[PDB]
Symmetry: C3
Subunit: 27 residues, 3 copies
């Protein structure tokens, strides 16, 4: 399926396990 927009909250997101996850978690 196609995935919905990531949160629009000033943060960058990456895709993991069917969810948008904060890039900062990996940095």
């Amino acid at each position: 399926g196609y995935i919905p927009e990531a949160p629009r909250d000033g943060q960058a997101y990456v895709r993991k396990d069917g969810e948008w996850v904060l890039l900062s978690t990996f940095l």
Copy 2:
């Protein structure tokens, strides 16, 4: 909503504030 394709310019993108932003911005 659903999300348009990122640029097909050979660069990696993350999703931020309803836009595709270069991953390199944050590395």
Copy 3:
């Protein structure tokens, strides 16, 4: 067109040239 779901495999993905690619390459 629209973005499809990434693999659901415990790894983080970013978008490049119409595909999902591993974030870990870049870190």
